[PDB]
Amino acid sequence: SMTEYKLVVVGACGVGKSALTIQLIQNHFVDEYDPTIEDSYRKQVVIDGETSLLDILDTAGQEEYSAMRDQYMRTGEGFLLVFAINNTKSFEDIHHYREQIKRVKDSEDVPMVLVGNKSDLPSRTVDTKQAQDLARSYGIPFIETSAKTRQGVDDAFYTLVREIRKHKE
Numbered sequence: 001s002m003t004e005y006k007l008v009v010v011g012a013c014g015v016g017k018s019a020l021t022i023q024l025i026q027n028h029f030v031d032e033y034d035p036t037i038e039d040s041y042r043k044q045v046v047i048d049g050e051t052s053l054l055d056i057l058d059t060a061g062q063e064e065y066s067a068m069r070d071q072y073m074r075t076g077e078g079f080l081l082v083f084a085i086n087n088t089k090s091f092e093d094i095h096h097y098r099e100q101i102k103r104v105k106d107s108e109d110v111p112m113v114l115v116g117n118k119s120d121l122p123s124r125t126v127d128t129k130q131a132q133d134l135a136r137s138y139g140i141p142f143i144e145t146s147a148k149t150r151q152g153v154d155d156a157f158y159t160l161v162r163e164i165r166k167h168k169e
């Protein structure tokens with residue numbers, strides 16, 4: 001029976017969580033996807049020759065950290081930490097999201113990938129060397145993406161599936 005991986009896309013408002021997920025699922029760039037809508041999506045993929053089913057949660061909509069919600073997020077097997085390269089606050093919010101995840105999972109090894117989205121933009125305020133360095137300190141992979149041009153979208157998600165597989169090993 002084909003393996004199921006539950007992936008959670010996290011990051012500040014407007015970083016591109018919805019546009020990344022819609023590119024992976026529908027291969028189309030949405031620029032007006034309702035910001036409050038928190039939906040999940042299923043996609044059958046072949047990664048390194050093994051077929052699997054991804055269940056992908058695109059987080060949305062401001063809410064306080066509750067206990068019920070903690071238990072819902074505990075079911076995530078892997079987390080995409082998304083910042084935008086032209087949003088210093090989005091980059092700064094990464095540590096906060098990683099700790100919340102370390103907390104609910106009650107564990108130091110959680111499968112995670114750092115994603116710097118909007119790499120198509122010319123106005124970059126977060127240097128590639130800064131994000132590499134952070135990812136090295138977490139010991140997680142770092143991918144630069146553009147949901148707009150589709151550069152790196154599949155690779156960010158499939159890098160996370162590979163982190164989950166190694167974890168399960």
Ligand SMILES: *CCC(=O)N1CC(NC(=O)c2c(Cl)nc(CNc3n[nH]c4cc(Cl)c(C(C)(C)C)cc34)n2C)C1
Nearest residue numbers: 012013035059060061063064065066069070073100101
């Ligand atoms: C347009 C607005 C938008 O896209 N965003 C993203 C940001 N929202 C959040 O950061 C957010 C959401 Cl969504 N829910 C919550 C708090 N709820 C919650 N309770 N327990 C947990 C546990 C975890 Cl691990 C999370 C993660 C997965 C880290 C988001 C969330 C909760 N927050 C802060 C506004």
Ligand SMILES: Nc1nc2c(ncn2[C@@H]2O[C@H](COP(=O)(O)OP(=O)(O)O)[C@@H](O)[C@H]2O)c(=O)[nH]1
Nearest residue numbers: 013014015016017018019030031118146147148
């Ligand atoms: N230029 C560029 N714009 C993007 C990219 N990704 C998303 N956007 C735009 O940024 C805004 C927020 O995207 P969205 O996916 O809704 O962000 P979310 O709140 O994290 O879901 C929208 O206008 C998108 O069209 C990208 O990779 N490059």
Ligand SMILES: [Mg+2]
Nearest residue numbers: 017018035060
């Ligand atoms: Mg969204």
